[PDB]
Amino acid sequence: PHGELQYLGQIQHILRCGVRKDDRTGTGTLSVFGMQARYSLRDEFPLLTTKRVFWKGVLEELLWFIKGSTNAKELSFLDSLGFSTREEGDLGPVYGFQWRHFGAEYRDMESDYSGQGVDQLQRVIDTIKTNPDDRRIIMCAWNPRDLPLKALPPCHALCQFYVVNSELSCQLYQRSGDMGLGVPFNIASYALLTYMIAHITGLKPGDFIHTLGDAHIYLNHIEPLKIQLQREPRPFPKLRILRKVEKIDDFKAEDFQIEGYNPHPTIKME
Numbered sequence: 001p002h003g004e005l006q007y008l009g010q011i012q013h014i015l016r017c018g019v020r021k022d023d024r025t026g027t028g029t030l031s032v033f034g035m036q037a038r039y040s041l042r043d044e045f046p047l048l049t050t051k052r053v054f055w056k057g058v059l060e061e062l063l064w065f066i067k068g069s070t071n072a073k074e075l076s077f078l079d080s081l082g083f084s085t086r087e088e089g090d091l092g093p094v095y096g097f098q099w100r101h102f103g104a105e106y107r108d109m110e111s112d113y114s115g116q117g118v119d120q121l122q123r124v125i126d127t128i129k130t131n132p133d134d135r136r137i138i139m140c141a142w143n144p145r146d147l148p149l150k151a152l153p154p155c156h157a158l159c160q161f162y163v164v165n166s167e168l169s170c171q172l173y174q175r176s177g178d179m180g181l182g183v184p185f186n187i188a189s190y191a192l193l194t195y196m197i198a199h200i201t202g203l204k205p206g207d208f209i210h211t212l213g214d215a216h217i218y219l220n221h222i223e224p225l226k227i228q229l230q231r232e233p234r235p236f237p238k239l240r241i242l243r244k245v246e247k248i249d250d251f252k253a254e255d256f257q258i259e260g261y262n263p264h265p266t267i268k269m270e
């Protein structure tokens with residue numbers, strides 16, 4: 001299947017063959033282990049069309065991630081340690097903080113981290129420039145919850161890049177994927193990251209490959225998904241970068257523009 005058809009085929013397989021399995025909430029899912037889909041990034045952008053995806057949220061959260069921000073306010077549950085720092089909106093050493101300063105000893109969210117920890121994201125961009133053929137062009141993200149982090153906790157997601165013939169491809173592997181909410185969002189998010197990296201390294205985007213471990217549908221999303229399945233996908237839009245950008249830190253929300261986006265209406269999901 002192709003384009004958004006893969007994602008609809010995957011919703012359908014989970015509904016038909018998914019097995020009931022409970023998550024840590026204790027809420028119910030239909031679950032299938034192991035799936036993959038590929039979305040071309042060539043002259044199109046996989047912002048799903050069978051429901052409207054919150055594009056602007058996708059962009060803004062990615063910029064906040066790229067900044068390595070740990071300040072919740074700068075943005076717009078069992079994750080918890082601290083008193084006045086929670087009121088502050090200080091999240092601790094989480095999210096983008098791992099992409100930019102992995103393993104840095106953490107002070108405060110207005111504290112200064114240049115040159116501290118590993119900059120995974122500059123590392124990716126640097127390797128693409130120094131050796132495009134490299135099979136290790138890999139960046140990892142963690143769920144805030146697992147972050148004891150002395151514990152050597154496993155990543156939530158892993159992102160591998162790949163270059164051939166001038167085209168930058170990305171594979172995202174997620175240990176679990178919420179198919180109703182998280183997945184359409186994550187597909188746009190990492191396809192956007194790919195476009196950004198490709199832009200500053202002089203490559204053209206190639207393929208985005210999305211791989212999951214526990215691919216799941218929340219019980220309360222079945223009916224709305226059953227209805228999304230009856231909708232016919234429309235051609236994906238295009239994503240245009242507006243000025244010439246040189247450094248990953250220099251991007252701004254106004255640098256990007258989506259075009260030809262005609263989704264079906266918003267679907268709201270609990």
Ligand SMILES: Oc1ccc(Br)c(O)c1O
Nearest residue numbers: 149150151152153154155
């Ligand atoms: O040093 C480390 C290396 C890889 C991973 Br994953 C860790 O969680 C860690 O603490």
